[PDB]
């Protein structure tokens, strides 16, 4: 069966054309590490690349870069063949000839300062007719050689010479413009794109396979997320690299024209796509198309909605087409569009976290070179509420500030601009600070759905609850068969109570990182926003967004905070229930336990929670967290003192044992006060980057004791009453 | 690289055509304080002005007034050159000839009570073909000389004489009507206008620079504020 085929997968490296394979492949075809390898593709063409050993990616696959993607005319989800070529190659001359498709507005010599620093210390083989992208000069341009020495025998070496003419050639339709968006041009969302990879690659790359079987492929995919998340770009990328026609109608181009022909344009948009099969249809804005919730106005609005419904209800097999739609909120879409056969498949895209925003930084700033002291890791940590488009706009605006500080004193007034100076427009630290301070975030009040960055080492002590949480939520996931064999269901939620200021959010956040799952945050103020708003529909989709991003964990903070505004044990004439208590448990009653989701309930006063929440079946696990012991506060303090420098004479064992009625927050505020007071001495002595023992005695003066003695007994009597292990604590069975 | 170029910035003074420079510039081109300086612009034309020392404005820039803005056909965000001219100039006669573009509804003698109190105690050099605005009579009117003694050698002194004819000339499209709104015609908002200065000057004065790079300029600016704040005038001036 010709055991040489390989599946095509997107690579992870950000370098030039370098492929990644697995460890048995190295000995399968007798290759070494640093050797030149030849690849054979379609259209009767060859390629040259470099093999790289990797053991983490997969067991049997290749990771092929964007350059040779388009160079070899091979798309994702295709067949490919590889073979060794241990031949000595020593290049001697190269012909340079760019294409005027993208070389516009750039004059001067762009071959001695632009291609020169990129080829050295690379040792990458080149082939006659290669298409590769390079960076420099606030823009990117490809390259293509039309006449040179016959390939093979081309290796980048200093002895090679160069010669330019200065007459670009006209491009043809045989190749594809690499300047378009590819699969590797989307960052910050890896779990969401993998679902599309296993949803769209089959019906598009294998039309006859689905035409021969009785499986009905999805006819509609709904895209979620705040505006600017990248919904349009995902649709543009999944269609341009599959050989399928892409047709885009955004949202208002239909309503802009006169009534009567707007429906005809929509109808012909579907008909033109069928002829160019396989094809795809993407709708950028649809919430403005079908506002059939509260609008109830306009005669032609419902006509357009019904026309769209008719056009997609009638989508029989015939040809291959996928309809894509994008919006801002799931509640802004006509429910008639969510029926089966129209939009039965849905996907939600959230705001990327630090590890996602980091990637979206370089994926946009790759075209400009940075300095040796400018890093994107620290700048991506302060931003938390920025949309994926916010970061791209921030980079573009920071480029303007970087060039403005020098263009005034340069004063180069001319018609054309050379490329010898546009590349030297480096950006420094002073520009990102101003750009990030001036930027205006868009999604600041959306649901906080990100992956935390805290582990078990950040929480000191509390070893008693660590085992209880470890034996409850990882066992059903890691060993599902054991729970099914006995015949009982695993627990669905854990609620804990204790004095305020004991890291009730830290253990809920850390449990998500060690289990490799998402994390949601529904705090108290976020739970009091609909008690007055008289809108019970917002609590509806907070569970949908959690179950779609499985696995995930639901966190509730100060669960009784609503009762404080209404009273408490007695309060008004009512009891301990309101318009929001009855909505928390009604939705989680009917959910499937089999789903990889969890509910965490954090509260300070457990005597106010209604017994209906604590009923067996919804929240039966009760854990009481007491005050930290002497041996735990040392770890708690050293976890917070990890970032700030610590002197050698700083003793922590004695400092931790002198606190008795201090909770977790009381230690953190003491450390904050000490390290703040350290800066005062450093500034006053300026007219040293290390803390000393003198900054402590002046900091423990402001030590606060929030947890008084009245609440300790109140919590202990409740915990003992709810535990009740007396009378039959030690008994031996006869048989 | 011809070390004589200077960036163009809006001045802060409310006087006639007086430029402001920095302290090293005074010794760079061996000028004194009270000397007549000559400026060279585009369209092959010259200008005359007075240098003023300032240490608070900036480190390397000029602060050029509204009169010679339109006189020298130089807009904000452009290049300019300056040079000293220590030549003794003693004017003797001037020709007065306004343009009927803005002189409407006003009759009588407007040259002996209107231009007279404005020229004394000023000692400002004038050039053949200058466009400057003056005030008086609940309105403002510019001035333009078409035929006089060949510039240089024109200094405001009491010994100079004046003579009027009374036949205004028709204007042309070579110059711009100074009666329109300029950058210095907006007051009370300094921090807001500086943002527009660094947002609109680049894509407008440098089209090829943005057409050659991959930076996407903003395609829309939203103006806020209560009605009447001056949103229309800012857009008209920029
Ligand atoms: N996740 C992302 N990866 C790469 N680029 C992005 C991402 N999100 C936004 N961008 C950039 O910002 C722009 C956002 O526009 P787009 O997402 O197409 O509109 P919408 O946000 O309505 O889907 C994109 O054109 C892209 O250049
Ligand atoms: N075991 C612990 N390890 C690390 N930090 C802790 C620990 N216990 C309490 N803290 C600190 O207490 C602070 C309060 O956390 P929080 O989750 O708000 O407490 P609560 O559960 O009362 O809301 C946290 O910032 C955390 O650093
Ligand atoms: N900040 C200002 N500076 C100078 N003139 C102003 C200012 N604000 C208002 N004006 C004067 O008052 C009027 C403001 O009207 P305008 O700003 O054009 O309408 P709007 O206030 O709706 O933008 C203009 O005629 C302008 O001359």
UniProtKB/Swiss-Prot annotation, chain B:
Q: Which residues of the complete protein appear here?
A: 21 to 258 of 806
Q: What is the effect of changing residue 159 to R?
A: No effect on binding to DERL1
Give the domain of life. Eukaryota
Provide the domain comment: The PIM (PUB-interaction motif) motif mediates interaction with the PUB domain of RNF31.
What is the stated purpose of this protein? Necessary for the fragmentation of Golgi stacks during mitosis and for their reassembly after mitosis. Involved in the formation of the transitional endoplasmic reticulum (tER). The transfer of membranes from the endoplasmic reticulum to the Golgi apparatus occurs via 50-70 nm transition vesicles which derive from part-rough, part-smooth transitional elements of the endoplasmic reticulum (tER). Vesicle budding from the tER is an ATP-dependent process.
> Outcome of altering residue 231 to Q?
Impairs ERAD degradation of HMGCR and does not inhibit interaction with RHBDD1
What does the annotation give as the result of altering residue 120 to D? Severely reduced binding to DERL1
Which gene carries the instructions for this protein? VCP
Known outcome of mutating residue 163 to W: Severely reduced binding to DERL1
Compartments, as annotated in UniProt: Cytoplasm, Cytosol; Endoplasmic reticulum; Nucleus; Cytoplasm, Stress granule
This protein's assembly is summarised as: Homohexamer. Forms a ring-shaped particle of 12.5 nm diameter, that displays 6-fold radial symmetry. Part of a ternary complex containing STX5A, NSFL1C and VCP. NSFL1C forms a homotrimer that binds to one end of a VCP homohexamer. The complex binds to membranes enriched in phosphatidylethanolamine-containing lipids and promotes Golgi membrane fusion. Binds to a heterodimer of NPLOC4 and UFD1, binding to this heterodimer inhibits Golgi-membrane fusion. Interaction with VCIP135 leads to dissociation of the complex via ATP hydrolysis by VCP.
* UniProt disease link: Inclusion body myopathy with early-onset Paget disease with or without frontotemporal dementia 1: An autosomal dominant disease characterized by disabling muscle weakness clinically resembling to limb girdle muscular dystrophy, osteolytic bone lesions consistent with Paget disease, and premature frontotemporal dementia. Clinical features show incomplete penetrance.
* PTM per Swiss-Prot/TrEMBL: Phosphorylated by tyrosine kinases in response to T-cell antigen receptor activation. Phosphorylated in mitotic cells. ISGylated.
Modification type Phosphoserine: residues: 17
Q: What is the lineage of its organism?
A: Eukaryota, Metazoa, Chordata, Craniata, Vertebrata
Q: Which residues bind ATP 1?
A: 227-233
Q: What is the protein's given name? A: Transitional endoplasmic reticulum ATPase
The family this protein is said to belong to:
Belongs to the AAA ATPase family.
The scientific name of the source species is: Homo sapiens
């Amino acid at each position: 069966n010709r055991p040489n085929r390989l599946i095509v997968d997107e690579a992870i490296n950000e370098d030039n054309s370098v492929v990644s394979l697995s460890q048995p492949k190295m000995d399968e075809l007798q290759l070494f590490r640093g050797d030149t390898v030849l690849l054979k593709g379609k259209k009767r063409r060859e390629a040259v690349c470099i093999v790289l050993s990797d053991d983490t990616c997969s067991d049997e696959k290749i990771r092929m870069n964007r350059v040779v993607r388009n160079n070899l005319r091979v798309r994702l989800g295709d067949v490919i063949s590889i073979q060794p070529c241990p031949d000595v190659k020593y290049g001697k001359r190269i012909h340079v000839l760019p294409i005027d498709d993208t070389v516009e507005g750039i004059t001067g010599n762009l071959f001695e300062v632009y291609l020169k620093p990129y080829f050295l210390e690379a040792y990458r083989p080149i082939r006659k007719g290669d298409i590769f992208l390079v960076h420099g000069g606030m823009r990117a341009v490809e390259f293509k050689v039309v006449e040179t020495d016959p390939s093979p025998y081309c290796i980048v070496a200093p002895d090679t010479v160069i010669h330019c003419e200065g007459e670009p050639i006209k491009r043809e339709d045989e190749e594809e413009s690499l300047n378009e968006v590819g699969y590797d041009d989307i960052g910050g969302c890896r779990k969401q794109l993998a679902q599309i990879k296993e949803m769209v690659e089959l019906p598009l790359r294998h039309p006859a396979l689905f035409k021969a079987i009785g499986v009905k492929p999805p006819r509609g995919i709904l895209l979620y997320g705040p505006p600017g998340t990248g919904k349009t770009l995902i649709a543009r990328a999944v269609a341009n690299e599959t050989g399928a026609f892409f047709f885009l109608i955004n949202g208002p181009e239909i309503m802009s024209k006169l009534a009567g022909e707007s429906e005809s344009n929509l109808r012909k948009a579907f008909e033109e796509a069928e002829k160019n099969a396989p094809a795809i249809i993407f709708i950028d804005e649809l919430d403005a198309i079908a506002p059939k919730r509260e609008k109830t106005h306009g005669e032609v609005e419902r006509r357009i909605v019904s026309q769209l419904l008719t056009l997609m209800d009638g989508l029989k097999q015939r040809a291959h087409v996928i309809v894509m739609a994008a919006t801002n909120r799931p509640n802004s879409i006509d429910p008639a569009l969510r029926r089966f056969g129209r939009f039965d498949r849905e996907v939600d895209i959230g705001i990327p976290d630090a590890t996602g925003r980091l990637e979206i930084l370089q994926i946009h700033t790759k075209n400009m070179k940075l300095a040796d002291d400018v890093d994107l890791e620290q700048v991506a940590n302060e931003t938390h509420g920025h949309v994926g488009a916010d970061l791209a706009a921030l980079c573009s605006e920071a480029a303007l500030q970087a060039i403005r500080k020098k263009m005034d004193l340069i004063d180069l007034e001319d018609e054309t601009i050379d490329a010898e100076v546009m590349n030297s427009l480096a950006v420094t630290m002073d520009d990102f600070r101003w750009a990030l301070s001036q930027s205006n975030p868009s999604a600041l009040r959306e649901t906080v759905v990100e992956v935390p960055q805290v582990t078990w080492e950040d929480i000191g002590g509390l070893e008693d609850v660590k085992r209880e949480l470890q034996e409850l939520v990882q066992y059903p996931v890691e060993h599902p068969d054991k729970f099914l064999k006995f015949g009982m269901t695993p627990s669905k939620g854990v609620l804990f109570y204790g004095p305020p200021g004991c890291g009730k959010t830290l253990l809920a956040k850390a449990i998500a990182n060690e289990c490799q799952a998402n994390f949601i945050s529904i705090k108290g103020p976020e739970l009091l926003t609909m008690w007055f708003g008289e809108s019970e529909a917002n609590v509806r989709e907070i569970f949908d967004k959690a179950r779609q991003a499985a696995p995930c964990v639901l966190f509730f903070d100060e669960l009784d905070s609503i009762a404080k505004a209404r009273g408490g044990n007695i309060g008004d004439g009512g009891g301990a229930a309101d318009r929001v208590i009855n909505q928390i448990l009604t939705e989680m009653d009917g959910m499937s336990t089999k789903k990889n989701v969890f509910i965490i309930g954090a509260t300070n006063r457990p005597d106010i929670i209604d017994p209906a929440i604590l009923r067996p079946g919804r929240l039966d696990q009760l854990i009481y967290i007491p005050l930290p012991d002497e041996k735990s506060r040392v770890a708690i303090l050293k976890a917070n003192l990890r970032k700030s420098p610590v002197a050698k004479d700083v003793d922590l064992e004695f400092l931790a044992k002198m606190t008795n009625g201090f909770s977790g927050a009381d230690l953190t505020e003491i450390c904050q006060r000490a390290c703040k007071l350290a800066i005062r001495e450093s500034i006053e002595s300026e007219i040293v980057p290390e803390i000393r023992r003198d900054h402590f005695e002046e900091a423990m003066r402001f030590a606060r004791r929030s947890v008084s003695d009245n609440d300790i007994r109140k919590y202990e009597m409740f915990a003992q009453t709810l535990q009740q292990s007396r009378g039959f604590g030690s008994f031996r069975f006869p048989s």
